[PDB]
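Course exercise 7: structure representation. Students receive a sequence record and must write out the corresponding structure in token form. The form below is the worked example handed out in class, using Acetaldehyde dehydrogenase (292 residues). Read each field label carefully; the graders check that inputs and outputs are placed in the correct fields and that the protein name is recorded exactly as given.

STUDENT ID: A-19
EXERCISE PROTEIN: Acetaldehyde dehydrogenase
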Amino acid sequence: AGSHMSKVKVAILGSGNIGTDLMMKLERSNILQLTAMIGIDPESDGLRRAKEKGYTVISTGIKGFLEQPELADIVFDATSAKAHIRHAKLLKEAGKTVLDLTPAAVGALVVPPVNLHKHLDEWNVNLITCGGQATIPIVHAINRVHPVGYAEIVATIASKSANIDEFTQTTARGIEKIGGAKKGKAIIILNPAEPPIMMRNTVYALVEEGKIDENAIVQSILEMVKTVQSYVPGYRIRTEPIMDGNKITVFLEVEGAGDYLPKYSGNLDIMTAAAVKVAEELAKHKLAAQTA
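STUDENT ANSWER:
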């Protein structure tokens, strides 16, 4: 105790691997204060972990949290898309802000260095997909220098991390709407190689008409890579951006932080890292607005 900088209280709905990984990351936040983990099974292994770490645990689900709504202003939903529909309805009615880490995609799709600044007041934000969080920054880095007519991303993840079809479509539509590409295509590839590989992504972009300012595009991409690295330290470009005519190719690799998820699960880790980053920017916005 004493005097302190203001923080926003947050709670994690879900007690599985994603929820536990979020909890590890939230401990390092200086603007978010994690207070509680919410599950449905009092014997949950993730609730035990959270109890041990000093947090409030709730094993009576969303209703149990809504009985103690002062625990949190921002809730991370790390359960499932089917469960998120009711969670979203009830959390919005209780005036809480929610970060959806599921594919339910009820709220606004956000990538923090691209379009978060237009969504600081949303009730519900969704983090799209791992491939989206990894590559939409790059598509945008290019599109804001020179309009992109077509972008294809190829996400290769370790096998140990209609699923494929639905995720490629949401990624591809995210590449268009948030990345800015007129047409987008997404490929997800699962690689069984042992030891497990770090997640890799390839971004192909075809830019539209006009003279190409190569230095400007490359500096925009390198700047984006640094910006993402600030909340995903293992996010890196593998070689320089390749130019051939109006075609630009960027090679990425995404090593996970290894907080609770393994380092080779960078596709899952980027989701919790991007969620924490989004919640921090929402938190700073909320703190600046209050009593007003």
